[PDB]
């Protein structure tokens, strides 16, 4: 039987030969995880003097 076994691992699909492999094995979300800016406590305390 023609089987899709585990192309990512050592196993290969039944239809694929010695010189072939699957073009698309995974899927991409396109939405990246990001980290927010740190908070700062000391900056609001300062008062500005013009130079």
């Amino acid at each position: 039987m023609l089987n899709y076994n585990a192309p990512t691992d050592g196993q290969k699909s039944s239809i694929d030969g010695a010189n072939s492999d699957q073009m698309q094995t995974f899927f991409w979300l396109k939405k990246a995880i990001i980290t927010a800016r740190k908070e700062q406590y000391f900056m609001p305390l300062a008062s500005v003097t013009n130079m």
């Binding site: 192309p7 990512t8 995974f26 899927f27 991409w28 979300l29 990246a32 995880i33 927010a36």
Partner: protein
């Protein structure tokens, strides 16, 4: 979607100043090449910061250079199913009608329970932040005998809270201010933690730093507060939820001698070993489910039923006296931020 394999991947972008950002683009203030690109890692030393500060003269050429990095994640899906079969005489001559309804109901309930267990074990396996009670460093080192038994304590919960706060994990709940009724006390807990039914007595026996009772039951703060489903109490900053079907590792602990003071044990290969219990904490946006042709749901169940008759007639059975029923589904999980999952492994009293 279809025709894309059985895997989903995603990128994560590391900030500039973390230790995970490793590269060779660095150039220090003197202009010489340097090993690390980021100015300084997650280091709070004043000496290191002073040494590695970016300073400029009037003419600044090729003085300070930086770099960046990104990380990738992945997850996969699997397939499950089971079935049963019967005859026509068993249905026609049986004492009570409606047996098929009972069988179908039990089949569906079993399927749902198996789905829940499969999800829970994956969540337990994929935990990122792990603490071991006592002096243990792994599952095999967990024991209830010796100078330091592997039992959860107040300081372990405090350390878990400190780590979660450091990871910038969001808080689930809000604090509770007191009411006017006598014998009612305040509880400032802001996170939710799930425990099994076996660990509750040990939590009840816990004491805080000053020897007072640490486990506050729900009847104390039921007024002026909202009680979650299955909640049993609150310790420190966590609110305890009791899950009926919480799983555990049996026999994963160290070998048990005759000096056992009353903790649960199990027999593995003719030898007695201790048990390990999860004490799980799940943060917000930690994971997501993968749905394959589920119409926007986590699970979709497919059921096929064939009754006895001409459709079941075959070469092996020319009369067609058999039938069956089956059910199957797809499941998979993707973990985005593993650090938001927390776990505390400990033994439980008998």
């Amino acid at each position: 979607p279809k025709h894309y394999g059985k895997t989903i991947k995603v990128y994560e972008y590391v900030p500039l100043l973390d230790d995970r950002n490793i590269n060779d683009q660095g150039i220090d203030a003197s202009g010489a090449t340097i090993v690390n690109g980021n100015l300084y890692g997650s280091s709070k030393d004043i000496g290191n910061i002073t040494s590695k500060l970016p300073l400029l003269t009037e003419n600044g050429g090729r003085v300070n250079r930086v770099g960046f990095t990104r990380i990738a994640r992945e997850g996969s899906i699997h397939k499950f199913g089971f079935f049963y079969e019967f005859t026509q005489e068993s249905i026609d001559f049986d004492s009570d009608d409606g047996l098929m309804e009972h069988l179908s109901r039990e089949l569906m309930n079993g399927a749902t329970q198996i789905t829940e267990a499969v999800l829970q074990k994956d969540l337990l396996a994929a935990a990122g932040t792990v603490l071991y009670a006592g002096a243990a460093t792994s599952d095999a080192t967990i024991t209830g005998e010796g100078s330091t038994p592997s039992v959860v304590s107040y300081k372990n919960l405090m350390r878990l809270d400190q780590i979660l706060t450091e990871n910038r994990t969001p808080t689930q709940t809000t604090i509770i201010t007191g009411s006017r009724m006598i014998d009612t006390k305040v509880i400032g807990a802001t996170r939710v933690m799930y425990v099994g039914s076996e660990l509750v007595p040990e939590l009840k026996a816990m004491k805080d730093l000053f020897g007072n009772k640490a486990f506050i039951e729900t009847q104390h703060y039921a007024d002026a507060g909202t009680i979650m489903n299955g909640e049993v109490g609150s310790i420190d900053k966590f609110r305890i939820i009791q899950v009926p079907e919480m799983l555990h590792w049996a026999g994963a602990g160290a070998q048990a001698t005759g000096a056992n003071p009353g903790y649960r044990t199990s027999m593995v290969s003719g030898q007695e070993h201790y048990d390990v219990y999860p004490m799980l904490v799940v943060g917000d946006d930690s994971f997501t489910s993968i749905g394959f042709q589920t119409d926007g749901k986590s699970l979709k169940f497919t059921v096929m039923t064939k009754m006895p008759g001409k459709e079941t007639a075959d070469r092996n059975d020319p009369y067609g006296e058999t039938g069956f029923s089956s059910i199957k589904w797809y499941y998979g999980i993707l973990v985005k931020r593993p650090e938001r999952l927390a776990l505390i492994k400990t033994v439980a009293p008998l």
